[PDB]
Amino acid sequence: HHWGYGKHNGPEHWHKDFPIAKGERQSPVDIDTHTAKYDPSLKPLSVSYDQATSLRILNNGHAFNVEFDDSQDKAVLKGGPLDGTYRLIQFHFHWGSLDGQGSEHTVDKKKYAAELHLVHWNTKYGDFGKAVQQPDGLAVLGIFLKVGSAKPGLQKVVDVLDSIKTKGKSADFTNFDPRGLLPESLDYWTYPGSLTTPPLLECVTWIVLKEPISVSSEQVLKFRKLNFNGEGEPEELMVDNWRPAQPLKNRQIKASFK
Ligand SMILES: NS(=O)(=O)c1cccs1
Ligand SMILES: [Zn+2]
């Protein structure tokens, strides 16, 4: 009996426990590509993932997270609109019950089948828990997934899902290279926003890549076999774990490309 994505506890209800849900810098948003402002002052992204150390994969009851060792500068994101160095701590996905929905951000109202979030925190704040309390604390790289050809670099994640089917299950997940999840181009949009699940803190610089990656129908089908529930509880399939677009309010979306 807490927040989730059901009819009785889903995104429309969250504001009752987390009033920041109606705040001024909430995410996700629709990216209107014609009113995004090209900003020549924006730098290319620098993704340095060569020394990434993955540790574990966890079903936390609303998604599955692949967690990384963030006790040193092993996998970091720099450049773009960021000042300073952000360390990778985990990635996860949001996805739908059908191929025509699943992403959190939309592009000219278009929904993708899923959205990948690579979550990084600003090393100047020392730990992730301190970082989420700051307006420049996190940087999340958002990558859209469309259904088409399979993504070979995603298959190791798909094959382990049977082992973490229910809430609270975890499995060792070492030597996974997140470089296999990136598109060819690193062109992006960026805007200031928030976590898209409770506690909905307004601490995120969003960097959303223009180029989607393709995954196969069989790959995304396997995401839809996970459960929101714990073992021994009534089965509820983990699907549609996305928050709908929020008002842009007083914000400008910037593009790194024209
Ligand atoms: N979905 S997200 O990337 O904004 C997020 C929620 C909690 C930690 S990171
Ligand atoms: Zn997310």
Short mmCIF file of C-alpha atoms and ligand atoms in Angstrom, two decimals:
data_model
loop_
_atom_site.label_atom_id
_atom_site.label_comp_id
_atom_site.label_asym_id
_atom_site.label_seq_id
_atom_site.Cartn_x
_atom_site.Cartn_y
_atom_site.Cartn_z
CA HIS A 1 0.00 0.00 0.00
CA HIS A 2 2.28 2.76 -1.36
CA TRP A 3 2.95 4.41 -4.67
CA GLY A 4 3.05 2.52 -7.93
CA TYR A 5 1.59 2.54 -11.43
CA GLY A 6 -1.83 1.02 -10.77
CA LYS A 7 -5.26 2.67 -10.97
CA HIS A 8 -5.35 3.32 -7.23
CA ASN A 9 -1.74 4.35 -6.60
CA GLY A 10 -0.44 5.58 -9.95
CA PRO A 11 1.02 8.92 -11.11
CA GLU A 12 -2.26 10.87 -10.72
CA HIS A 13 -2.17 10.04 -7.00
CA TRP A 14 1.45 10.74 -6.19
CA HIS A 15 0.94 14.42 -5.28
CA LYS A 16 -0.89 13.40 -2.08
CA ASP A 17 2.27 11.93 -0.57
CA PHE A 18 4.78 13.97 -2.61
CA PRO A 19 3.46 17.49 -3.18
CA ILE A 20 6.52 18.35 -5.28
CA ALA A 21 4.72 16.32 -7.97
CA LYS A 22 3.03 19.58 -8.93
CA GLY A 23 6.30 21.57 -8.85
CA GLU A 24 7.92 23.87 -11.39
CA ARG A 25 10.58 21.53 -12.79
CA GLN A 26 8.97 18.11 -13.06
CA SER A 27 9.84 15.42 -15.59
CA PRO A 28 9.28 13.88 -18.09
CA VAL A 29 8.16 16.43 -20.69
CA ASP A 30 7.23 16.41 -24.36
CA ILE A 31 10.11 17.68 -26.48
CA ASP A 32 8.66 19.92 -29.15
CA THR A 33 11.42 19.82 -31.76
CA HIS A 34 10.43 23.08 -33.42
CA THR A 35 10.56 25.20 -30.27
CA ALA A 36 13.74 23.63 -28.89
CA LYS A 37 16.53 26.20 -29.08
CA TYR A 38 19.78 25.25 -30.75
CA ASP A 39 22.59 26.36 -28.37
CA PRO A 40 26.09 26.56 -29.99
CA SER A 41 27.54 27.05 -26.51
CA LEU A 42 26.73 23.41 -25.65
CA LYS A 43 29.69 21.03 -25.65
CA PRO A 44 29.75 17.48 -26.96
CA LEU A 45 29.04 14.86 -24.32
CA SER A 46 32.04 12.95 -22.97
CA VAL A 47 31.08 9.43 -21.94
CA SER A 48 33.92 7.51 -20.40
CA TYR A 49 32.63 4.02 -19.68
CA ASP A 50 35.75 1.95 -20.46
CA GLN A 51 36.39 1.10 -16.78
CA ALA A 52 32.76 0.58 -15.69
CA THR A 53 32.34 -2.14 -13.03
CA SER A 54 28.83 -3.54 -12.93
CA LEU A 55 27.89 -5.33 -9.70
CA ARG A 56 24.32 -6.53 -9.47
CA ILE A 57 20.86 -6.45 -11.02
CA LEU A 58 17.88 -5.85 -8.72
CA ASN A 59 14.09 -5.94 -9.13
CA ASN A 60 13.03 -3.11 -6.79
CA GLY A 61 9.30 -3.49 -7.37
CA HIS A 62 8.93 -0.82 -10.00
CA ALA A 63 11.74 -1.45 -12.45
CA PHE A 64 15.00 -3.40 -12.53
CA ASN A 65 18.27 -1.56 -11.88
CA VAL A 66 21.72 -2.59 -12.98
CA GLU A 67 24.07 -1.19 -10.30
CA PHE A 68 27.68 -0.09 -10.68
CA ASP A 69 30.62 0.49 -8.36
CA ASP A 70 30.62 4.29 -7.90
CA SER A 71 33.28 4.42 -5.17
CA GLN A 72 35.78 5.83 -7.70
CA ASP A 73 35.73 7.66 -11.03
CA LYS A 74 35.37 4.53 -13.18
CA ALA A 75 32.41 5.34 -15.41
CA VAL A 76 31.79 9.04 -15.72
CA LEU A 77 29.88 11.55 -17.78
CA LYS A 78 31.33 15.04 -18.43
CA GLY A 79 30.84 17.83 -20.92
CA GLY A 80 27.57 18.71 -22.60
CA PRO A 81 25.70 21.16 -20.31
CA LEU A 82 27.44 19.81 -17.21
CA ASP A 83 30.04 21.42 -14.98
CA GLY A 84 32.27 18.86 -13.33
CA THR A 85 32.20 15.09 -13.20
CA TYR A 86 29.25 12.77 -12.76
CA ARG A 87 29.64 9.10 -11.82
CA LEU A 88 27.42 6.33 -13.13
CA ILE A 89 25.51 4.59 -10.30
CA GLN A 90 22.78 2.57 -12.04
CA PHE A 91 20.70 2.20 -15.19
CA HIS A 92 17.09 1.06 -15.58
CA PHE A 93 14.26 1.17 -18.11
CA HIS A 94 10.62 2.21 -18.33
CA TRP A 95 8.44 0.32 -20.78
CA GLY A 96 4.89 -0.33 -21.92
CA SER A 97 2.35 -3.12 -22.22
CA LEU A 98 2.25 -2.51 -26.01
CA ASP A 99 4.94 -1.32 -28.47
CA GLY A 100 3.23 2.05 -28.99
CA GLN A 101 3.87 3.31 -25.47
CA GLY A 102 6.46 2.93 -22.76
CA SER A 103 8.76 5.93 -22.95
CA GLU A 104 8.53 8.77 -20.42
CA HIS A 105 9.76 11.59 -22.65
CA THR A 106 8.00 12.02 -25.97
CA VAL A 107 9.23 13.75 -29.13
CA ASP A 108 6.55 15.84 -30.86
CA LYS A 109 4.05 13.71 -28.90
CA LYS A 110 5.56 10.50 -30.28
CA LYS A 111 5.95 7.67 -27.71
CA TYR A 112 8.64 5.02 -27.98
CA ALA A 113 8.42 1.39 -26.72
CA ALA A 114 10.78 2.00 -23.82
CA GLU A 115 13.23 4.48 -22.36
CA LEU A 116 16.66 3.72 -20.87
CA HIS A 117 17.92 6.00 -18.01
CA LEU A 118 21.62 6.01 -17.15
CA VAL A 119 21.77 7.74 -13.78
CA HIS A 120 24.87 9.73 -12.69
CA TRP A 121 25.62 11.88 -9.65
CA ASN A 122 27.79 14.95 -9.20
CA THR A 123 31.00 13.94 -7.40
CA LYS A 124 31.29 17.31 -5.67
CA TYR A 125 28.49 16.22 -3.29
CA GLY A 126 30.33 13.07 -2.18
CA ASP A 127 27.47 10.55 -2.26
CA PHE A 128 24.23 9.97 -4.17
CA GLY A 129 22.06 10.73 -1.13
CA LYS A 130 23.58 14.21 -0.80
CA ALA A 131 23.44 14.80 -4.56
CA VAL A 132 19.65 14.41 -4.85
CA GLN A 133 19.20 17.36 -2.49
CA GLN A 134 20.94 19.75 -4.94
CA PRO A 135 19.64 21.41 -8.09
CA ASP A 136 22.66 20.18 -10.14
CA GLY A 137 23.02 16.89 -8.27
CA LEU A 138 22.17 14.33 -10.96
CA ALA A 139 22.55 13.92 -14.69
CA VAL A 140 20.42 11.29 -16.36
CA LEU A 141 21.09 10.21 -19.93
CA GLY A 142 17.82 9.17 -21.59
CA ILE A 143 17.85 6.87 -24.64
CA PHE A 144 14.72 5.84 -26.55
CA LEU A 145 14.09 2.26 -27.65
CA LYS A 146 12.14 1.44 -30.78
CA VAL A 147 11.13 -2.06 -31.83
CA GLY A 148 12.96 -3.39 -34.88
CA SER A 149 16.20 -5.31 -35.05
CA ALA A 150 17.70 -6.83 -31.89
CA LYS A 151 20.36 -5.07 -29.87
CA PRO A 152 23.16 -7.60 -29.18
CA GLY A 153 24.54 -5.59 -26.26
CA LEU A 154 21.21 -5.81 -24.44
CA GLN A 155 20.87 -9.58 -24.56
CA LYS A 156 22.93 -10.30 -21.41
CA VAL A 157 20.45 -8.15 -19.47
CA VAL A 158 17.42 -9.90 -21.03
CA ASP A 159 18.75 -13.36 -20.24
CA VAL A 160 19.13 -12.73 -16.51
CA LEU A 161 15.59 -11.39 -16.01
CA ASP A 162 14.16 -14.83 -15.20
CA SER A 163 16.32 -14.81 -12.07
CA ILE A 164 14.87 -11.54 -10.68
CA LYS A 165 11.25 -11.97 -11.59
CA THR A 166 9.76 -10.68 -8.33
CA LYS A 167 10.28 -7.66 -6.10
CA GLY A 168 13.37 -7.82 -3.88
CA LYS A 169 15.25 -10.43 -5.95
CA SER A 170 18.83 -9.62 -6.96
CA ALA A 171 21.53 -11.43 -8.95
CA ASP A 172 25.25 -10.90 -9.37
CA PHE A 173 25.83 -9.10 -12.68
CA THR A 174 29.50 -8.47 -13.33
CA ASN A 175 31.47 -7.44 -16.38
CA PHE A 176 28.56 -5.83 -18.18
CA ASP A 177 29.69 -3.05 -20.57
CA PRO A 178 27.14 -0.23 -20.88
CA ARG A 179 28.82 1.06 -24.08
CA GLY A 180 26.80 -1.58 -25.93
CA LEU A 181 23.61 0.35 -25.15
CA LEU A 182 24.57 3.66 -26.82
CA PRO A 183 23.43 4.88 -30.25
CA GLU A 184 25.91 5.96 -32.91
CA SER A 185 25.29 9.70 -32.50
CA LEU A 186 25.45 11.55 -29.16
CA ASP A 187 23.40 14.58 -30.30
CA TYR A 188 20.98 15.56 -27.55
CA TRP A 189 18.36 17.79 -26.03
CA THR A 190 18.76 19.03 -22.47
CA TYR A 191 16.54 20.71 -19.85
CA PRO A 192 16.38 20.98 -16.04
CA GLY A 193 13.96 18.51 -14.47
CA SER A 194 13.30 15.95 -11.78
CA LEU A 195 13.32 12.29 -10.86
CA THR A 196 10.35 10.69 -12.58
CA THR A 197 9.42 8.48 -9.60
CA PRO A 198 8.93 9.49 -5.98
CA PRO A 199 10.49 11.29 -4.24
CA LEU A 200 10.31 13.37 -7.47
CA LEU A 201 13.15 15.62 -6.37
CA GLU A 202 14.07 18.48 -8.69
CA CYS A 203 17.75 17.66 -8.92
CA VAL A 204 18.24 16.39 -12.49
CA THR A 205 19.88 17.79 -15.60
CA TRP A 206 18.22 15.71 -18.29
CA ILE A 207 20.20 14.80 -21.38
CA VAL A 208 17.98 13.00 -23.90
CA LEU A 209 19.61 11.50 -27.01
CA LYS A 210 18.05 12.22 -30.37
CA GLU A 211 18.87 8.84 -31.91
CA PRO A 212 16.90 5.85 -30.58
CA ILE A 213 18.35 2.37 -30.31
CA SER A 214 16.51 -0.59 -31.82
CA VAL A 215 15.63 -3.69 -29.83
CA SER A 216 13.68 -6.70 -31.02
CA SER A 217 10.08 -7.58 -30.14
CA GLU A 218 11.42 -10.70 -28.33
CA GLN A 219 13.74 -8.57 -26.23
CA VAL A 220 11.04 -6.16 -25.00
CA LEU A 221 8.59 -9.09 -24.51
CA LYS A 222 10.96 -10.38 -21.87
CA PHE A 223 10.76 -7.10 -19.92
CA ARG A 224 6.99 -7.57 -19.75
CA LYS A 225 7.34 -10.90 -17.93
CA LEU A 226 8.67 -9.31 -14.76
CA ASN A 227 6.42 -8.82 -11.72
CA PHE A 228 5.70 -5.76 -9.54
CA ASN A 229 4.85 -8.12 -6.68
CA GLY A 230 7.03 -10.09 -4.30
CA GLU A 231 7.26 -13.89 -4.48
CA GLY A 232 4.21 -15.64 -3.07
CA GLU A 233 2.02 -12.63 -3.77
CA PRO A 234 -0.69 -12.35 -6.45
CA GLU A 235 0.96 -11.83 -9.88
CA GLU A 236 0.92 -8.33 -11.35
CA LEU A 237 2.98 -7.96 -14.55
CA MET A 238 5.54 -5.15 -14.53
CA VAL A 239 4.35 -3.08 -17.50
CA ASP A 240 3.58 0.61 -18.07
CA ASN A 241 5.97 1.83 -15.42
CA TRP A 242 6.14 5.28 -16.99
CA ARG A 243 5.00 8.70 -15.81
CA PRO A 244 3.12 10.83 -18.31
CA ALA A 245 4.50 14.12 -19.62
CA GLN A 246 4.36 17.09 -17.22
CA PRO A 247 3.93 20.79 -17.99
CA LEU A 248 7.09 22.55 -19.21
CA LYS A 249 6.22 25.71 -17.33
CA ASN A 250 9.03 28.18 -17.20
CA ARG A 251 11.68 26.11 -18.96
CA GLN A 252 13.46 26.06 -22.26
CA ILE A 253 14.63 22.84 -23.93
CA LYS A 254 18.03 23.29 -25.64
CA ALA A 255 19.39 21.25 -28.54
CA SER A 256 23.06 20.46 -29.24
CA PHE A 257 22.32 20.16 -32.97
CA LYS A 258 20.47 22.03 -35.72
N1 LIG B 1 13.60 7.53 -13.53
S1 LIG B 1 14.76 8.51 -13.03
O1 LIG B 1 15.94 8.35 -13.82
O2 LIG B 1 14.37 9.90 -13.03
C1 LIG B 1 15.11 8.02 -11.40
C2 LIG B 1 14.23 7.73 -10.30
C3 LIG B 1 14.98 7.40 -9.10
C4 LIG B 1 16.39 7.43 -9.29
S2 LIG B 1 16.69 7.87 -10.86
ZN ZN B 2 13.90 6.30 -14.97
#
